[PDB]
Structures are given as C-alpha cells and as structure tokens.
Design a protein around this ligand. Structure first.
Ligand SMILES: Cc1noc(C)c1-c1ccc(CNS(=O)(=O)c2c(C)nn(C)c2Cl)cc1
Length: 250
C-alpha cells in the first residue's frame, strides 16, 4: 500500500493547467514565448497554492517560503513538463499544456529548437528510468527544497527536518516497486543523481530566461506579474552562483 504522505502529495497535485494559446494562428517566436510565459504565470500561481498545502512548508518562516519558491520555480516547471510529456505523449512531444504541445517538427520550426532539445532531455530520462508517480511526487518536493541562501534560512532547523523527512519518503517510494537492497540503494543513487544533474540543465534555462527578460520589449515577449517579480527578486543572484545548491553527491 502507498504510504500516507505520498497519498497526500498525490491529493494536492494541481489540476490541468491550460496555456490559453491561440492555435488557429501560425506560430511566431513572440506568440509562442508569450504563451509559454502566460502558462508559466499560471503554473507559478499553482505552485504557490500547492506549497500552502504541502506538509511542513507553511511552518517555515514566511521569508524562507518566498525564497524557496523564488529559487526553485524554473526547476519545478521543467520537472513537471517532463512528467506531463512522459505521461500523456510517451515522452515524444513537449507537453507544456493540453493546448500547447510541441512535437519535434514544431520544435524545429521554433526559434528555440536547442532549448526544446535541452528540455526534452528530462522526459526521455523519465522513459529510461521508468519513474513512478510516487517517486516523482517526492522528487518534486525535494526540488522545492534543493537550494538555500549562502547564509542559510531563518528556519534552518525546521528546513533540515522537512528536507530529511521527504528524503526518507523518497526512500519509501523506491521501496514500493524495487524489492531488494542492492537495487533499492542503486535506485536511490540514480534518482538523486538525476536531481543533482538538473541543477546544470536549469542553469541553461535560467540564462535563457534572464536574456529573454532583459530583451523582452525588443522580442515582443510579455512577462506577467509574478513571473517578473520572482525573476527580478533572485535570478541574477542564482545565475551568479551566489546561492547554495544542495547536492546529494560529490
Ligand atoms: C511553463 C513551462 N513549462 O515548462 C517550462 C520550462 C516552462 C517555462 C519556464 C520558464 C519560463 C520563463 N520565461 S523564459 O525563460 O523566457 C521561457 C519561455 C518563454 N519558454 N521557456 C521554455 C522558457 Cl525557459 C516560461 C516557461
């Protein structure tokens, strides 16, 4: 049977989120990126809502809650994109939303094919490892908790306890299918290594983001309110490496 914290995590997952994209018109770089940013804003709002229901999170200092959301949003978005692509189209298209799906041809015709290929890595990796929903749910929490300030958090003690709790929960999730101690220990390494490796992929997305934000008027790319807020709040600092990424391994 499923451990209760994992069942809770499944129950607080966001519903389907639409981009609001107009698919009756041919793609342009402006229109596609603008629609992705509108989808982004909606997903960001859902992350905030989810975080209010996430066990432990509300008990961190409010300033730590804001910081963790501001540090982790890109990671959470691309991880979710990977999962949706894996679950709905067998990993073979980028499933941003039910109304915004990029097959490879649409990726190629875009102005950001290379970015698409970088993002397309994650679902191909989920296909490879056959990530379970229970593993995904725990891993996604750990991504929320995977970078802290250089000076640490105000609620550092509670944060450490929360993070450790979800790491123990991931171990329980692995235990649902992987019977055997050797396989289970190796799977822990693999999933946590995948999380370590996401830091590098996300850095590429962060650089793209900040360049796009700076150039948004010239590119005719709209950045909505909360997205602009989180970018302005922390993105240069994150890109500069003036934060502490938490690594599971060397
Ligand atoms: C939404 C969504 N789903 O997966 C990913 C990745 C996103 C996402 C993540 C970040 C942003 C912020 N803007 S951006 O960095 O210029 C950008 C745009 C526009 N599209 N993408 C994929 C990025 Cl990154 C917009 C969309």
């Amino acid at each position: 049977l499923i451990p209760p914290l994992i069942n809770l995590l499944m129950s607080i997952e966001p519903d389907v989120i639409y981009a609001g994209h107009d698919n009756t018109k041919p793609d342009t770089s402006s229109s596609l990126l603008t629609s992705l940013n509108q989808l982004g804003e909606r997903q960001l709002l859902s992350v905030v809502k989810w975080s209010k229901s996430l066990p432990g999170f509300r008990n961190l200092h409010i300033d730590d809650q804001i910081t963790l959301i501001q540090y982790s949003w890109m990671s959470l978005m691309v991880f979710g994109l990977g999962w949706r692509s894996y679950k709905h189209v067998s990993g073979q298209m980028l499933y941003f939303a039910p109304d915004l799906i990029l097959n490879e041809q649409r990726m190629k015709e875009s102005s950001f094919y290379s970015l698409c290929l970088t993002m397309w890595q994650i679902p191909q990796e989920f296909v490879k490892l056959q990530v379970s929903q229970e593993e995904f749910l725990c891993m996604k929490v750990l991504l929320l908790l995977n970078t802290i300030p250089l000076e640490g958090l105000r609620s550092q003690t509670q944060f450490e306890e929360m993070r450790s709790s979800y790491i123990r929960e991931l171990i329980k999730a692995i235990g649902l299918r992987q019977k055997g101690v050797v396989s289970s220990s190796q799977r822990f390494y693999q999933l946590t290594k995948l999380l370590d490796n996401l830091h590098d992929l996300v850095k590429q997305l962060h650089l793209y983001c900040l360049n796009t934000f700076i150039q948004s008027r010239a590119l005719s790319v709209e950045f909505p309110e909360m997205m602009s807020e989180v970018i302005a709040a922390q993105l240069p600092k994150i890109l500069a490496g003036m934060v502490k990424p938490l690594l599971f391994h060397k």
